[PDB]
Design a protein around this ligand. Structure first.
Ligand code: KEE
Ligand code: NA
Ligand code: NA
Ligand code: ZN
Ligand code: ZN
Length: 380
């Protein structure tokens, strides 16, 4: 049986300027996905679980105390709980954004009444779902959550992320269940700099990201192929980094090629007990060159989901990260839940299924393969 998680309190994370048109990561993203699953009958076939807020203890597996006080509490308790006197003056943390609202860095917003709650419910929702699948109470699941997580570093929010929901899930799985091997696949078009950071030296967690890299200036500018891990973790960080720009743009042929030749062989060798997926949908057609640039179909994510479902005895959980375009993210979410439920994949055209990946795609794949050939038998 497939699980779903969602909570309407996540809608309340909204800029104080009162206008979501200045802020791409907006409440409507989840709301629409949520109704799409209703109007297709998919929600009816799933178990919808009860979310909760993450405790500060739970957030502190990934993030510092200072950071968890700053973004996990309302202002009154923020003083109450900072007995260690870690925080300086809030005067220096808050700035006025170009839209007139309150934020923290030049891009990222902050609502003092609602964002802390919302950021913590996003984590707690994922955690609840992940643990329910890991203990075998559910087959698999999809976490329709907001705000996103994978850019949140130990002590820095960025890319509209405040806490790394998926990282925390994983850490809790280690600490409270002693799960031996965890796989995190991050197919959001942007690199998950936070997640990479959180497990770079840990060989019991393998992080694989497919993302646009282009020689280091695509956001967030981390995630190079030769970043492979450190210490005992060497080899358990796989950056499937696409280089060459948008000439031509990457699409279904390219991604399916990378799965077959890089992601799935390595994942199979690792043979993980649980699979977590940072499931951003910004790689889909309809994401302009700043936000995306690539041309995947939503359908395609059905194929990617199905492939991952073969691992870990099916114990797979997808959590929303990026993806802006409403049609795209609803279509893609449709495909994935449909896959998780067990339905036959709504296919791609034979024209595509026979397409050789572009020169850039191939070159990008061969560089990763050469590097990780040192660490994985299936690449020799
Ligand atoms: O997709 C994403 N993360 O995975 C990131 C945010 C996102 C998430 C969800 C919905 C919409 C957007 C998008 C982002 C892209 C570029 C910059 C940027 C550009 N120049 C400096 O910083 C900042 C944020
Ligand atoms: Na990624
Ligand atoms: Na690792
Ligand atoms: Zn604003
Ligand atoms: Zn993204």
């Amino acid at each position: 049986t497939t699980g779903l998680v969602y909570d309407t309190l996540m809608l309340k994370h909204q800029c104080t300027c009162g206008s979501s048109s200045s802020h791409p990561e907006h409440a409507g993203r989840i709301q629409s996905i949520w109704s799409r699953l209703q109007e297709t009958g998919l929600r009816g076939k799933c178990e919808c679980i009860r979310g909760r807020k993450a405790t500060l203890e739970e957030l502190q597996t990934v993030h510092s105390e200072a950071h968890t006080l700053l973004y996990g509490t309302n202002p009154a308790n923020r003083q109450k709980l900072d007995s260690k006197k870690l925080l300086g003056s809030l005067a220096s943390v808050f700035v006025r954004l170009p839209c007139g609202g309150v934020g923290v860095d030049s891009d990222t917003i902050w609502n003092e009444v609602h964002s802390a709650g919302a950021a913590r419910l996003a984590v707690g929702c994922v955690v609840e779902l992940v643990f329910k699948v890991a203990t075998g109470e559910l087959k698999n699941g999809f976490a329709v959550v907001r705000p996103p997580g994978h850019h949140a570093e130990e002590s820095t929010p960025m890319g509209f992320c405040y806490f790394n929901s998926v990282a925390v899930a994983a850490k809790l799985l280690q600490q409270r269940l002693s799960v031996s091997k965890i796989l995190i696949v991050d197919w959001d078009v942007h690199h998950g700099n936070g997640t990479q950071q959180a497990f770079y030296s840990d060989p019991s967690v393998l992080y694989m990201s497919l993302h646009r890299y282009d020689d280091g200036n695509f956001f967030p500018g981390s995630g190079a192929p030769d970043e492979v891990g450190t210490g005992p973790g060497v080899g358990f960080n796989v950056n499937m980094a696409f280089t060459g720009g948008l000439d031509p743009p990457m699409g279904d042929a390219e991604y399916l090629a990378a799965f077959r030749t890089v992601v799935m062989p390595i994942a199979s060798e690792f043979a993980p007990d649980v699979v977590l997926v940072s499931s951003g949908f910004d790689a889909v057609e309809g994401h302009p060159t700043p936000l995306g640039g690539y041309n995947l179909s939503a359908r395609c994510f059905g194929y990617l989901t199905k492939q991952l479902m073969g691992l870990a005895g099916g114990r797979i959980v997808l959590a929303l990260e990026g993806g802006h375009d409403l049609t795209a993210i609803c279509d893609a979410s449709e495909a994935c839940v449909s896959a998780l439920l067990g339905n036959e994949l709504d296919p791609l055209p034979e024209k595509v299924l026979q397409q050789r990946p572009n020169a850039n795609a191939v070159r990008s794949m061969e560089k990763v393969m050469e590097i990780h050939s040192k660490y994985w038998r299936c690449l020799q």
